[PDB]
Design a protein around this ligand. Structure first.
Ligand SMILES: CCCCCCCCCCCCCCCCCC(=O)OC[C@H](COP(=O)([O-])OCC(O)COP(=O)([O-])OC[C@@H](COC(=O)CCCCCCCCCCCCCCCCC)OC(=O)CCCCCCCCCCCCCCCCC)OC(=O)CCCCCCCCCCCCCCCCC
Ligand SMILES: CCCCCCCCCCCCCCCCCC(=O)OC[C@H](COP(=O)(O)OCCN)OC(=O)CCCCCCCCCCCCCCCCC
Ligand SMILES: CCCCCCCCCCCCCCCCCC(=O)OC[C@H](COP(=O)(O)OCCN)OC(=O)CCCCCCCCCCCCCCCCC
Ligand SMILES: NC(=O)C1=CN([C@@H]2O[C@H](COP(=O)(O)OP(=O)(O)OC[C@H]3O[C@@H](n4cnc5c(N)ncnc54)[C@H](OP(=O)(O)O)[C@@H]3O)[C@@H](O)[C@H]2O)C=CC1
Ligand SMILES: CCCCCCCCCCCCO[C@@H]1O[C@H](CO)[C@@H](O[C@H]2O[C@H](CO)[C@@H](O)[C@H](O)[C@H]2O)[C@H](O)[C@H]1O
Ligand code: SF4
Ligand code: SF4
Ligand code: SF4
Ligand code: NA
Ligand SMILES: [Zn+2]
Lengths: 103, 208, 112, 114, 342, 125, 145, 95, 205, 178, 95
């Protein structure tokens, strides 16, 4: 049961998102970023939003930056619950998963 | 002060110009162009022979220390003879800066592999080979990474069709998943969106 | 003295001052084989001499680490070893030469 | 007309790598057929190997033959390590695909395509 | 042609083939191959079914969206037969049983139901009627099922004079009751063969060829009114066939003779089974009725199909009858059977 | 070190494209014509490469437009007529080039609308 | 232009004219550019379109009820820069971004006018002129269109 | 309204209906043709013409921001009504 | 935490497991907790701040052994530090508009779309052609919950992107799975996969 | 600012008082008993479960669910075949055809949403200038065949009439945020 | 909330926490599910004057990148000033 080599074969969920993005506008392409790290949705949208804003040379207004940091940190708590409890679920501790998925 | 236009800064653009001249003086054998965008991002465009030396100096030099390979990727521009632009995005934690190093390739001109410089690149170079068919010399394990086994073609090349050439279904006669030429009940509808009026006078090209 | 460096796998160096004096001097010697016109030599000698002076100037490890501005003095020793490694490779690469080959006319023109 | 070589310096030095790849593919058919429990014969498998090597019989640029050899080694490896499956190996045999007639009249009766 | 049936595309699933077939019996062994061939080329297929929906699930993935239409029917009710053949330009009859039940005997399945379908197809205005029968169908036949098939052919051609009649020999495939029937004799230690199997000749045909020629008859102009003989390319004595099968499964072959009347009496016991009989008297008879020689009847090759040898495709049927020790044995390890030109 | 390859570049065997769509396809190298409903000329600068139209038919279920052509929506963009030809050449597509149609220079003159004795005297503003 | 409106008043509305079965007029969209008037006068030689009224009430048209029938009349649809003059046969059927443009030739006559054929989902939508200086310039006959 | 064809199939408000011999009628066997029975053309014709005094009248469809973009209709052509291009309401001038 | 942090069966399954040294963390392309688990002091919210992250106060948890247990403690302590940030956002939330007051990029309000001719036009172009982005390229990265999440975006001047490369933090983490699993049992590979925080939507794309 | 999660080596001395505490921790499994306590406390908490389908999870008026075509209060269709929902649809899920009606109106003869291409992004709801296409609040419309999820115009108008009472009130509760 | 005071003591002690103060379930402290209408504010460019677009247009301020070097004693520099070492948290340096 000792591991000598690990050979991850990925690509079983390659869907050509980067090629599909090329046939979309900068708004039509936004929902693809929700489905990348599909546990960290609004954080992905922000990464895409900041890129286009840099290229557009525009600035989001003061309140929307606080909304984006507010939901940016809700998503982190979302992402860390999934990471921590599903990690504990693999190790064999299944109860914490049910406590935090209510949250 | 304009509440809609992005704050411009000043010092960072001056700093990255100084370092861009720095890099060009030291590696004159490889550097072909140095530019800094209005976003304030430094770009070094090198001859492909210079890849390994250029990323080695930028990694190990004391006034650089770009030790993280943020990512490596290619862009396909068919109008160019060397249609593949290879892009390295590097990160310096010591100086809290970023730098982009670009070289080029064609279909039959492989690049050297930087796996000896950044282990991070191992899978990134597999992805360039898979998606664009850019071979890398001295890669420890160059093989497809993202496409299906026995997939023919390089689907991120601009001339590769969006839906590809083959599709899969289960065939109960032979009792397995088979590949067949692609036919779509509904074709992907191409939209002509470009406006016929020029939006950016600053990027207008001479009509020569 | 330090209990730990705070980086996993970076071992505390008991005698950083001597260790750094070695590495910089080893680096200044290998630099003497470059052409006098090579920018890598001119610049890397400023950096090494700047950092060699500070070692001779500050006997205290904690006060030295603030002068060098490179993190724990174990990181600085590591970075000095990386620098000396590069000076060997640069000598064979000979990057000071003229440009190997210019790109086609519109290699870097964007947008097309 | 001068260009960097990949591996071979001209077509003859590249055919050496081709025959060496054909040898390896030839030695591996009896295993692929045995391990993957394919429903073909070795002779039928080996013929298919030969058919794929002759699909690229017109290539002459040495750099191109380098990249066909490079790909063929990748294909050989995907099969020896059983990263491919029955479905993947059996795709070479196009068993479910009716083949389009190559005569004008049959094409003319069948649709607008040339 | 009506504008909605002109064939477009390139004969893929999303194409239009111009065929709108109601296949009666698509839920059986040959049915899934007929629907798949029709479905893969882009044909509308109407599938009347009497079974549970669970039993027609494997057919759902045989056509693009919309190309398969499942209908409930009861063979006793005429009005349901009209409901299905109403919109077709071809009707294919594959109804059949290898045994008799309480509610349907060989006359019902092989005579009345085919005539009911053909009678409704003629009234509905269907261009083609493809009816499957048997190679050894004949009124002077020992087998009770094989006489009814002979009657059924004639009923069908009385009410649909231009019906196309397909006569396959024994069909062998993954779900057949032919090679899987003999491979299953191993459960009884020995293989009872009437006259030791040396008087019976068989010319079995692969199911995909039968189905591929049935579909080719849905579009061949020179098929209306003909009778076809679909047969394999090789004739074998039953003994050599049954011996070859056990060679393909690597089981121990211990053949012994058994007089037809003792063999016929055993088949009656297994026919008492309330479920699907393992064998029957009629199935034992048919196994030993020898294939007729092919004399003046167009065959598979006249419908553009090249018969597949029993050697290419046996291992896909028989590998599951092996033990672990022989699962991986390749086709070549088995000596091929011996053919006979009579 | 360089080698001599005395043959034109062909990469067809590396692109993984079925034989069907290399030998029977004709590409059209051209500059798009200005859309005549608008006056802008910004879509008339670059060269395009498009493939010959293939059959579309109506889906039986919904009436959508079905296709068996994988290259129907392929549109490459190039800066020069020569770059587009080279790309088609190294790919084996038979090409067909059309020369750029520029608007010929015209003589305008507001003062011509009031000519003392020429037919260019307009009768209304 | 700008991205805002600071116009807080009521808008004008002009009654439409019926000038034949080919060209639909919705003149509230007219920007009084007089391209139609100049085209008709100097390309078709049909001095029947003009401007009546004056000031903000000025309206293009024919005053009386005349049909703008001419073998070249359909070209006002192209040169009208807005939706004031649009094609009745084509009306409401497609949007520009949808359509695929195939650059073809016209065979209704022997002049061989260069045209563009818009198609959408395998169907012909409208014929448009393609510019060719030495043949049809930027016009086509109504039969072609 | 929901006319019925000679074949017995209901005709949708867009006038579509499979022919007699169209095989595609088989999809409705043991099922039904989804048809919307409130023909908007028939419903809009039932509304009365609103009479107004001025010669130019603005329609936004009602509900303000819950309607359609606000447009104006001329009412001079005193022989036909003015029709809203969005909602289809009709207007006519009082005198 | 009462169930995991001090539990001896949790510590045994996670302590000394998947140890990654700092210098190998950097050379493998790791980021986020895979960096800060090994002692490296890096957090893009701190070092290259975006939005209003340079106005909210919070601490970055650092590890000392770079194994599965330290990463677990860093993630648990980050959830507490996100709570620290959320409290500040709720009190410092300001009034104002929500999309940039520039209707050639961000569509106008529906009320204006149905009243102003400039607003309707801009609505029509934004929801059909979209806005044009000036030609150029950018590499934007954020401290996503898994680590540096980067977009390399190429604009050709039109309303559609030319190139869009996504830098998935989990892509390089998965490539370090082989390295982190030297001398471990199959039941540890299960733990090492979990500690890297793997979602394959980003890795594969 | 940074903090240490797993640093504590400010080593103290093992008193006999403290060593006996470490041993009782190890021998008596005290921290493992604390974990048993936490799951015991949860046993006597009220479960978070709701009694579906008799109880439903909360939703907001913005909820993006099944599509529908709306009308004006007079019964006229709102959709004017502008095709903006079609130009924005990220999934190319909407197909539209139009022509002049019998009364001359601009109206669609076709309007399809392939609900298996749709990503339920709600972008069509934003693009529509007359609130014709909306995503209603229905989410319980799973079918037994793929073909039933290809909605044509009749089906979508029927959903509009079915759900209008509830759609209209959700727009009334939310249009001021738009 | 409905739990008897005996079970509250039992589960407070078993957990070692005061659960009653911080319940996982939600009761009345949630917001009302029907709120009054909003009245959202406009932006800084909703002025009627002194608001020409060309003076607040960001997309048009972008320029092509500066070309520092191309094919068309000096002190050494770093890409930026060295990063400052982070300070240890005063709130809780050692969790
Ligand atoms: C013998 C026992 C084993 C046999 C099992 C069956 C008997 C059940 C247990 C005894 C009854 C206790 C139930 C109760 O407490 O009532 C409260 C409960 C309602 O009170 P509640 O509103 O939930 O308030 C309690 C708090 O929520 C929450 O209150 P709490 O959590 O704080 O606990 C309340 C109390 C309860 O603990 C006790 O056991 C007493 O616990 C204590 O206070 C300490 C225990 C001393 O009563 C019920 O729900 C009745 C359930 C039974 C109804 C049967 C329905 C008819 C079906 C007939 C056909 C099918 C029958 C099955 C066929 C087989
Ligand atoms: C007068 C003369 C007196 C003579 C008698 C003296 C007796 C003194 C008392 C001795 C009690 C011995 C009990 C056994 C305790 C024990 O062995 O536990 C230690 C064991 C080791 O765990 P470890 O991770 O190794 O930590 C310590 C480092 N060695 O750790 C464990 O055992 C953990 C096992 C836990 C597995 C989960 C089981 C569930 C526990 C909850 C159920 C409680 C009932
Ligand atoms: C099936 C479901 C389980 C069936 C059995 C359920 C029985 C329910 C009724 C039990 C009633 C128990 C009364 C508890 C009284 C109480 O309030 O607990 C307080 C007591 C400690 O008192 P406290 O003030 O909180 O702290 C001071 C510490 N010196 O705390 C204590 O001392 C309580 C210790 C004993 C509690 C035992 C109850 C748990 C029963 C479940 C057994 C495990 C099942 C698995
Ligand atoms: N070896 C062979 O397979 C050969 C077959 N044939 C003929 O080919 C045809 C099909 O062969 P095969 O596929 O093996 O037959 P199956 O045993 O597969 O049964 C075929 C179909 O008959 C249907 N069926 C039987 N009785 C009735 C009934 N009373 N009412 C309605 N449907 C009924 C079954 O439906 P359900 O499953 O719901 O009963 C089944 O779908 C038959 O005519 C058979 O005689 C000819 C020569 C050889
Ligand atoms: C004196 C004793 C003499 C020995 C007995 C004589 C031999 C009689 C038995 C022969 C073998 C019976 O073996 C039986 O074969 C039949 C024929 O396919 C199979 O019959 C059935 O199998 C599976 C079951 O779902 C179906 O897919 C198949 O279509 C159906 O026919 C049985 O699964 C098998 O059990
Ligand atoms: S061309 Fe059109 S916009 Fe110009 S004046 Fe004529 S009708 Fe009005
Ligand atoms: S919700 Fe999004 S994907 Fe679905 S129809 Fe509307 S725009 Fe298209
Ligand atoms: S639903 Fe709305 S956006 Fe779509 S075509 Fe109709 S009016 Fe236009
Ligand atoms: Na016009
Ligand atoms: Zn209106």
């Amino acid at each position: 049961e000792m591991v000598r080599k690990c050979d991850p074969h990925i690509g079983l969920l390659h869907r050509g998102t980067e090629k599909l993005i090329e046939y979309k506008t900068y708004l039509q392409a936004l929902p693809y970023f929700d489905r990348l790290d599909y546990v960290s949705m609004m954080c992905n949208e922000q990464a895409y939003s900041i890129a286009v804003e840099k290229l557009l040379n525009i600035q989001p207004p003061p309140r929307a930056q606080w909304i984006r940091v507010l939901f940016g940190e809700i998503t982190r708590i979302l992402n860390h619950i999934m990471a921590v409890t599903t990690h504990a679920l693999d190790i064999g501790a299944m109860t914490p998963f049910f406590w935090m998925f209510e949250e | 002060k304009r509440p809609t236009v992005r704050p411009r800064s000043d010092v960072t653009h001056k700093q990255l110009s100084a370092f861009g001249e720095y890099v060009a003086e030291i590696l004159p054998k490889y550097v072909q162009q140095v530019q800094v965008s209005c976003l304030d991002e430094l770009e070094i465009c090198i001859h492909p022979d210079g890849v390994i030396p250029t990323l080695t100096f930028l990694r190990d030099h004391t006034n650089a220390q770009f030790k993280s390979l943020a990512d490596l990727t290619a862009v396909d521009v068919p109008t160019r003879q060397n249609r593949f632009e290879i892009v390295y995005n590097l990160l310096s934690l010591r100086f809290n800066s970023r730098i982009r190093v670009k070289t080029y390739a064609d279909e039959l001109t492989p690049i050297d592999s930087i796996v000896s410089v950044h282990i991070a690149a191992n899978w990134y170079e597999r992805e360039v080979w898979d998606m664009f068919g850019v071979f890398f010399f001295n890669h420890p394990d160059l093989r497809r990474i993202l496409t299906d086994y026995g997939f023919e073609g390089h689907p991120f090349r601009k001339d590769f069709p969006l839906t590809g050439y083959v599709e899969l279904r289960y065939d109960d006669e032979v009792k397995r998943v088979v590949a067949e030429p692609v036919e779509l009940a509904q074709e992907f509808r191409k939209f002509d969106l470009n406006s016929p009026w020029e939006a950016f006078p600053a990027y207008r090209q001479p009509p020569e | 003295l330090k209990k730990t460096t705070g980086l996993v796998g970076l071992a505390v160096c008991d005698t950083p001052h001597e260790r750094l004096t070695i590495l910089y001097t080893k680096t200044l010697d290998i630099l003497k084989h470059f052409p006098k016109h090579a920018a890598y030599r001119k610049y890397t000698e400023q950096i090494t001499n700047e950092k060699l002076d500070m070692v001779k100037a500050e006997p205290d490890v904690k006060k030295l680490e603030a002068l060098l501005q490179g993190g724990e003095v174990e990181e600085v020793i590591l970075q000095a070893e990386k620098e000396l490694s590069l000076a060997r490779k640069m000598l064979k690469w000979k990057p000071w030469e003229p440009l190997v080959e210019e790109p086609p006319a519109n290699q870097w023109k964007w947008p097309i | 007309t001068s260009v960097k070589p990949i591996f071979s310096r001209d077509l003859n030095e590249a055919k050496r790598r081709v025959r060496e790849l054909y040898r390896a593919w030839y030695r591996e058919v009896p295993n692929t057929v045995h391990l993957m429990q394919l429903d073909i014969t070795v002779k039928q498998g080996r013929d298919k190997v030969r058919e794929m090597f002759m699909k690229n019989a017109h290539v002459t640029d040495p750099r191109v033959v380098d990249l066909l050899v490079i790909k063929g080694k990748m294909e050989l490896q995907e099969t020896i390590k059983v990263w491919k499956q029955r479905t993947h190996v059996m795709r070479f045999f196009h068993e479910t695909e009716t083949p389009r007639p190559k005569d004008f009249l049959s094409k003319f009766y069948m649709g607008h395509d040339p | 042609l009506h504008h909605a049936v002109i064939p477009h595309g390139k004969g893929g699933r999303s194409s239009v083939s111009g065929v709108v077939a109601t296949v009666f019996g698509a839920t059986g062994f040959l049915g899934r191959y007929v629907v798949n061939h029709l479905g893969r080329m882009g044909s509308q297929v109407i599938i009347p079914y009497r079974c549970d929906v669970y039993d027609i699930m494997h057919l759902r993935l045989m056509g693009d969206l919309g190309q398969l239409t499942f209908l409930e029917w009861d063979a006793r009710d005429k009005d349901s037969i009209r409901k299905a053949v109403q919109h077709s330009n071809v009707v294919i009859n594959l109804i059949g049983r290898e045994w008799e039940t309480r509610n349907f005997d060989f006359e019902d399945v092989f005579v009345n139901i085919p005539r009911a379908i053909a009678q409704a197809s003629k009234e509905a205005g269907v261009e083609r009627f493809i009816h499957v029968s048997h190679l050894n169908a004949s009124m002077k036949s020992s087998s009770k099922s094989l006489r009814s098939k002979a009657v059924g052919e004639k009923e069908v051609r009385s009410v649909f004079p231009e019906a196309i009649i397909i006569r396959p020999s024994d069909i062998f495939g993954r779900e057949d009751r032919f090679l899987n029937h003999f491979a299953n004799y191993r459960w009884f230690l020995a293989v009872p063969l009437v006259s030791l199997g040396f008087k019976t000749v068989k010319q079995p045909v692969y199911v995909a060829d039968v189905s591929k020629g049935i579909v080719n008859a849905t579009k061949d102009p020179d098929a209306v009114g003909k009778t076809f003989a679909f047969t394999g390319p090789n004739r074998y004595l039953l003994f050599h066939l049954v011996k070859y099968i056990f060679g393909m499964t690597h089981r121990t072959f211990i053949p012994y003779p058994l007089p037809l009347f003792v063999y016929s009496w055993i088949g009656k016991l297994f026919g008492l089974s309330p479920f699907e009989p393992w064998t029957t008297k009629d199935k034992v008879e048919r196994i030993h009725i020898s294939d007729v020689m092919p004399t003046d009847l167009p065959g598979l090759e006249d419908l553009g199909v090249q018969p597949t040898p029993l050697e290419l495709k046996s291992i896909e049927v028989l590998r599951r009858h092996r033990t672990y020790r022989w699962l991986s044995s390749e086709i070549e390890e088995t000596k091929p059977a011996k053919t006979v030109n009579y | 070190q360089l080698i001599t390859v005395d043959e034109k570049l062909d990469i067809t065997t590396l692109t993984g494209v079925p034989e069907e769509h290399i030998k029977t396809r004709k590409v059209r190298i051209f500059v798009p014509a200005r859309n005549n409903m608008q006056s802008g000329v910004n879509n008339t600068k670059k060269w395009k490469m498009e493939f010959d139209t293939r059959e579309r038919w109506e889906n039986p279920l919904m009436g959508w437009a079905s296709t068996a052509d994988p290259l129907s929506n392929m549109v490459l963009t190039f800066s020069a007529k020569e770059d587009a030809i080279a790309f088609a050449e190294k790919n084996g597509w038979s090409y067909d080039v059309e020369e750029k149609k520029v608007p010929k220079p015209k003589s305008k003159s507001y003062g011509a609308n009031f000519s003392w004795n020429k037919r260019t005297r307009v009768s209304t503003k | 232009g700008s991205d805002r409106s600071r116009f807080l008043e009521g808008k004008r509305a002009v009654e439409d004219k019926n000038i034949g079965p080919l060209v639909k007029t919705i003149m509230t969209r007219c920007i009084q550019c007089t391209r139609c008037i100049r085209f008709a006068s100097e390309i078709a030689g049909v001095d029947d379109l003009g401007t009546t009224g004056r000031g903000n009430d000025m309206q293009v048209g024919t005053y009386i009820e005349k049909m703008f029938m001419s073998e070249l009349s359909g070209n006002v649809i192209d040169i009208c820069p807005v939706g004031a003059l649009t094609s009745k046969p084509y009306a409401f059927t497609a949007r520009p971004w949808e359509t695929r443009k195939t650059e073809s030739i016209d065979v209704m006559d022997a002049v061989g006018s260069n045209i563009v054929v818009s198609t959408r989902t395998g169907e012909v939508m409208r014929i448009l002129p393609r510019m060719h200086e030495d043949i049809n310039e930027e016009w086509i006959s109504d039969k072609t269109r | 309204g929901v006319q019925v064809s000679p074949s017995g199939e209901k005709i949708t408000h867009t006038g579509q209906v499979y022919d007699e011999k169209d095989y595609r009628r088989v999809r409705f066997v043991d099922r039904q043709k989804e048809v919307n029975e409130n023909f908007a053309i028939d419903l809009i014709a039932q509304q009365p013409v609103n009479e107004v005094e001025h010669r130019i009248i603005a329609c936004d469809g009602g509900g303000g921001a819950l309607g359609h973009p606000k447009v104006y209709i001329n009412l001079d052509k005193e022989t036909k009504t003015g029709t809203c291009g969005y909602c289809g309401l009709q207007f006519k001038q009082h005198h | 935490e009462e169930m995991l942090t001090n539990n001896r069966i949790w510590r045994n399954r996670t302590v000394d497991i998947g140890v990654v040294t700092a210098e190998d963390a950097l050379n493998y392309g790791f980021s986020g907790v895979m960096l800060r688990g090994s002692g490296i002091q890096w957090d893009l919210r701190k070092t290259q701040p975006y939005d209003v992250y340079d106005q909210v106060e919070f601490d970055v948890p650092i590890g000392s052994r770079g194994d599965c247990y330290d990463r677990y403690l860093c993630r648990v302590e980050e959830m507490r530090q996100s709570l620290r940030i959320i409290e500040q956002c709720l009190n410092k939330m300001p009034p104002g508009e929500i999309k940039v007051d520039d209707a050639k990029v961000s569509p106008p309000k529906r009320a204006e779309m149905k009243t102003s001719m400039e607003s309707l036009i801009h609505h029509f172009k934004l929801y059909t052609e979209g806005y044009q982005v000036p030609p150029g390229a950018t590499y934007t990265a954020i401290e996503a919950p898994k680590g540096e999440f980067g977009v390399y975006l190429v604009s050709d001047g039109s309303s559609r992107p030319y190139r869009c490369k996504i830098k998935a933090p989990g892509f390089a983490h998965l490539a370090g799975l082989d390295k982190m699993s030297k001398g471990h049992m199959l039941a540890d590979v299960v733990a090492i996969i979990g500690t890297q925080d793997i979602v394959f939507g980003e890795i594969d794309r | 600012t940074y903090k240490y999660v797993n640093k504590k080596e400010q080593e103290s001395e093992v008193d006999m008082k403290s060593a006996t505490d470490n041993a009782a921790r190890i021998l008596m499994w005290t921290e493992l008993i604390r974990g048993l306590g936490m799951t015991l406390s949860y046993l006597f908490r009220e479960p978070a479960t709701i009694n579906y389908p008799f109880e439903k999870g909360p939703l907001s008026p913005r909820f993006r669910g099944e599509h529908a075509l709306r009308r004006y209060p007079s019964g006229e269709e709102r959709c004017i075949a502008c095709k903006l929902c079609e130009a924005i649809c990220p999934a190319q899920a909407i197909t539209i055809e139009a022509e002049p009606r019998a009364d001359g109106s601009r109206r669609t003869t076709r309007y399809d949403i392939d609900m298996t291409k749709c990503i339920y992004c709600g972008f069509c709801q934003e693009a529509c200038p007359v609130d014709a296409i909306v995503e209603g609040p229905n989410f319980e419309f799973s079918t037994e065949t793929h073909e039933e999820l290809l909605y044509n115009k009749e089906k979508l108008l029927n959903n509009g009439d079915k759900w209008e009472a509830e759609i209209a009130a959700n727009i009334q509760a939310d249009y001021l945020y738009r | 909330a409905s739990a008897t005071r005996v079970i509250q003591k039992l589960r407070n002690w078993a957990s070692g926490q005061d659960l009653q103060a911080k319940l996982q379930l939600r009761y009345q402290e949630i917001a009302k599910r029907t709120q009054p209408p909003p009245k959202l504010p406009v932006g800084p460019s909703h002025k009627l004057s002194n608001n020409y677009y060309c003076t607040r247009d960001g997309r048009r301020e972008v320029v092509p990148p500066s070309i520092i070097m191309s094919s068309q004693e000096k002190k050494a520099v770093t890409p930026a000033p060295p990063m400052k070492r982070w300070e240890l948290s005063k709130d809780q340096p050692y969790l």
